Design a protein around this nucleic acid. Structure first.
Lengths: 59, 59
RNA sequence: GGGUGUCGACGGAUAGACACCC
RNA sequence: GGGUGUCGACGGAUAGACACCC
C-alpha cells in the first residue's frame, strides 16, 4: 500500500505506460481519469473480477 | 482517457498486478491508496518525471 | 450559466445521467 | 471527542504534519 495526496486537477503515475488524473470530487464521489494503452487493462474492482472469471461481453 | 466514479471506501484496478483505493478526500485533496509489487514503479506526476531524469535514492 | 448531493457504466470518454437551489 | 481547510512526501505506509471552530 502506497498512499499519496492529490488536489483536484493534478495527476499521478504508475509503471512506465500508465498515468492517472484526479478530475474532481462531488460529495464523496470522485471522478478519476486513467490514461493507458489498450495493450493493458483497466477496470473498476467490481468489473476486474469478471475479466478473470469467464467474460460476459467478449465482443 | 478512461474516467470512472468512486465513492470513498471503494476500489479500482489496473493491469493484472495493480489495485487502487479511494481512501478519502479532504477539502480538494484526495487520499489515494495503491497496491502493486515492487516489480513495478508508482509515483506522483511531480516525481515520476524524476525517476526518468536521474536519481540516487534507490539501492 | 452557476452551486450541491445522488446515480450509472468491462466505460478506454478530461466522459456521462438524475434531482434540488440561485 | 467532532467538523473544516491547508501542508508535506520517489513515500510502497488504509500512511503522516499544521491551523481554525465546537
Amino acid at each position: 500500500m502506497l498512499i499519496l495526496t492529490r488536489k483536484v486537477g493534478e495527476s499521478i503515475n504508475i509503471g512506465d505506460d500508465i498515468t492517472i488524473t484526479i478530475l474532481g470530487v462531488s460529495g464523496q464521489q470522485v471522478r478519476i481519469g486513467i490514461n493507458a494503452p489498450k495493450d493493458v487493462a483497466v477496470h473498476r474492482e467490481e468489473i476486474y473480477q469478471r475479466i478473470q472469471a469467464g467474460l460476459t461481453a467478449p465482443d
